[PDB]
Amino acid sequence: EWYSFLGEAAQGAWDMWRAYSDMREANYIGADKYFHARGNYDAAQRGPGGAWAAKVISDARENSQRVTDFFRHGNS
Amino acid sequence: EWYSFLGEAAQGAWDMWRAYSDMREANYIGADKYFHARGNYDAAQRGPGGAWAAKVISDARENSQRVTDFFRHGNS
Amino acid sequence: EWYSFLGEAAQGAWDMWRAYSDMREANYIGADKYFHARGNYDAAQRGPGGAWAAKVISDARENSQRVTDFFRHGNS
Amino acid sequence: EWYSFLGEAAQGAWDMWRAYSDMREANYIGADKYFHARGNYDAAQRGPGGAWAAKVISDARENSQRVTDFFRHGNS
Amino acid sequence: EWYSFLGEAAQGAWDMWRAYSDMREANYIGADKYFHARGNYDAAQRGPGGAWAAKVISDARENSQRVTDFFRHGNS
Amino acid sequence: EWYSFLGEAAQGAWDMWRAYSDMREANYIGADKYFHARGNYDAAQRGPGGAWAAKVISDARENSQRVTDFFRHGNS
Amino acid sequence: EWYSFLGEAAQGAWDMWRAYSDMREANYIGADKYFHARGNYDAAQRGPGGAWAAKVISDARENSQRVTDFFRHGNS
Amino acid sequence: EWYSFLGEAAQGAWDMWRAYSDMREANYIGADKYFHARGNYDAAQRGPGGAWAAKVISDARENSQRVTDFFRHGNS
Amino acid sequence: EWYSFLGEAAQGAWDMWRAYSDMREANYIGADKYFHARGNYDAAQRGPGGAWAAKVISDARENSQRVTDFFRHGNS
Amino acid sequence: EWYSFLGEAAQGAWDMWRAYSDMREANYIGADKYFHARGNYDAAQRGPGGAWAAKVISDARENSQRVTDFFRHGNS
Structure with missing residues (x-):
């Protein structure tokens, strides 16, 4: 008996890995670059202004789980 | 008996991996570049302004699960 | 007995992998580039302004599941 | 009996690892660069101004779990 | 009996490790660089101004858990 | 504009009420009554025995809802 | 504009009330009554025995909700 | 603008009330009554025995809610 | 603007009240009554025996809530 | 602006009150009554025996709450 419901299961080599995450200069807010300005x-x-937020994230887990009424019996 | 309902199952080599995620300069908000401006x-x-948010994410998991009324018996 | 309902199952090599995700400069909001402007x-x-949000995501999972009334018996 | 509900399970070598997370100069807020300005x-x-926050995170876990009414019996 | 609900379980070598987290100059707020300015x-x-905060974090855990009504019996 | 999708809406008197729910002696499990027995x-x-549960409920609500991507604008 | 999605809305008198819930002697487990027994x-x-639970409930609410990405703007 | 998603809303008199909940002698576990017994x-x-629980409840609320990414703006 | 998501809202008289909760002798565990017994x-x-609990409750609230990323702006 | 998420709100008279909670002799554990017994x-x-607990409660609140990232701005 092997059961899964939401499951990351690996039974081998070089599985489910992640190597490169490249986000350079991703988020410029109200910034200026390489300019000449007068008046x-x-x-x-x-x-x-006002109510705002800027967030930059690479890897993040925010799971939540609700387990209720779980009954387990062995061999009779 | 092998059962799955929502399942990432790998029984081998070099499976389900992810190598390159490349998002350079993705999100410029109200920014200017390479200009000449007067008055x-x-x-x-x-x-x-107002109520706003800017978010840049590469990898993120936000699963949620609801398990209820699970009964398991063995051998009789 | 092998059952699946919504299932990513791999029994081999070099299966279901994803290599390149390339989104450069995807999302410019109210930005200007390479211009000359007067007055x-x-x-x-x-x-x-107002109520708005800009989001750039490469890989993300937001599954949800509802499991109820699951009964399992063995050998008699 | 092997059961999982939300599970990162690895039974091998070089599985589920993550090597490179590269976010240089990601978040410039109200900044200027390489300019000449007069008046x-x-x-x-x-x-x-106002009520705001800027956050940059690489790796973070914020899981939450709710376990209730869990009954386990052995062999009879 | 092997059960997991939210679980990082590794039964091998070189699994789930994380090597490089590189975020140089990520968060410049109201700063200027390489400029000439007059008047x-x-x-x-x-x-x-106002009510604000800037936070830069590499690795952080903020889990919370709620365990209630857990009953365990042995062999009869 | 009046819209509903799954809705219990009453605009009057003596509507949608429920008076009598009568379930006497509903659930006898492994019980005996009014007998004479020898040996x-x-x-x-x-x-x-094993893994089982008996539940008697009169009124109960266990709804769940998933709301995403809701945009509202006023008068222009 | 009046919208509802899953809604108990009453705009009147004597609506949606519930008066009588009568469950006498509902749940007898392994009990005997009015008998004569020898040996x-x-x-x-x-x-x-084993792993089991008996629950009797009259009124109970166990709703759960998931609200994400809700934007509201006023008059322009 | 009047919106509800999961809502008990009453705009009147004598609405949604609950008067009588009558559960006498509901839960007898391994009990005997009105008998004569020898040997x-x-x-x-x-x-x-084992791992078990008996619960009797009349009124109970165990809601849970997940609110994320809520933006509100006024009049412009 | 009037919004509710999970809400008990009453705008009147004699609404949502609860008068009688009557559970006499609800929970007898391993008890005997009105008997004659020999040997x-x-x-x-x-x-x-073992690991068990008996609970009788009339009224109880055990809500839990998760509020994240809430932005509010006024009039512009 | 009037918003509620999990809220007991009453804007009137004689609302949401609770008068009678009657649980006489609810929980008898291993007790005997009105009997004649020999040998x-x-x-x-x-x-x-073992690990057990018996609890009788009338009214009880055990809420828990998680508030994060709440931004509020006034009039501009």
Whole structure:
């Protein structure tokens, strides 16, 4: 008897591995690059503002589980 | 008896692996690049504003499970 | 007896793997590139604003399962 | 009897490992780079402001579990 | 009897290890770099302000668990 | 605009009520009543045994819902 | 705009109420009543045994909900 | 705008109330009543035994909820 | 704007109240009543034994909640 | 703006009250009543034994809550 319901099961070699995750300069918020500027934004309003968040994540687990009413008996 | 319901099962070599994930400069929000500007945005309003979020993720698991009323008996 | 209902089952070599995921500069929101500008957006309103979100994801699992009333008996 | 419900199970060599996570300069908020500027932002208002947060994470686990009413009996 | 519900189980060699986590210069908030500037921000207001936080984390665990009503009996 | 998808909506009087639920002596498991017995069950084995449960419920709700990607805008 | 998805909504009088739930002597497990017995069950084995539970409930709610990615904007 | 997803909402009088819950002598486990007995159960084994639980509940709430990524903006 | 997700909301009189919960003599475990007995259970073994619990509850709340990533903005 | 997620909210009179909880003689464990007995249980073993608990509760709250990443902004 071998049962699985949501399962990462590996019975061998070089299985389910992950090598390269490459995210360079992913998230620029309200930034400027390689420019020449004169007198712009006179008396202006520029973001970020209000209620906000910026998140950068590579690997993360946030599982949740609900186990109830589990009965197990052996050999009779 | 071998049963699975939602299952990642590998019984061999070099199975289900993932090598390259390449997302360079994916998410620019309200940014400028390689420009020449004079006197623009006079007394203007520029975002980001309000209620917002920017998220960049490579690998993430957020499973949830509900197990109820599970009965197991052996040999009689 | 071998049963599956929704199942990723591999019994061999070099099966179900995924190598290259390439999404460069995928998501530019309200950004400008390689321009020359004078006096535009005078007293104007420019987004992003309000209630919004930008998300870039490569690999993600968000399964959910509901298991109820599972009975198992052995040999008599 | 081998059962799993949400399970990372490896019965071999070189399985489920993760080598490279590369996120350089991921999150620039209200920053400028490689520019020449004169007299801009006269009497202007510039973010970040309000209620906000910036988070950069590589590896993180935030699981939660709810186990109730678990009964186990042996051999009779 | 071998059961797991949320489980990192390794029965071998070189399994589930993690080698490189590389996040250089990830989080610049309201910073400037490699620039020449004259007379900008005259009588202006510049962030960061208000209620905010910046966090950079490599590895972190924040699990929580709720175990109730667990009954175990041996051999009869 | 009035929309419903799975909905118990009552706009009146004396609607959808439930008065009498009468289940007397519903569930007798391995019980005997009003008998005369001599010497039966000599060296015998009688249930209940193994992995089992008996539940009697009158009213119970165990709904579950999955809401994703809900966007609402007002008047322009 | 009035929307509901799974909803108990009452806009009146004497709606959706529940008065009588009557379950007398519902659950007798391995019990005997009104009998005369001599010498039975000599050297015998009688249940309840193993892994089991008996539960009697009148009213109970065990809902669960999953809300994700909800965006709301007002008037423009 | 009035929205509900799983909701007990009453806008009136005498709605959704519950008056009588009557469960007398519901749960007798291994009990005997109104009998005359001689010499039975000689050298016998009688339950309850093993891993078991008996629970009687009238009213109980065990809800659980998962709220993520909720954005709200006002009037512009 | 009026929103609810799992909500007991009453906007009136005599709503959602509960008056009578009557569970007399609900849970007798290994008890005897109104009997005449001679010489039974000679050298016998009688439960309760092992790992067990008996619980009687009238009203109880055991909710749990998970709130994450909640953003609220006002009027602009 | 009026929002609730798991909420007991009453905006009126005589709402959500609970008057009578009546559980007389609910939990008798290994007790005898109104009997005449001679010479029974000769050299016998009688429960309760092992690891067990008996609990009787009328009203009890055991909530738990997990609040994370909550951002609130006012008027702009």
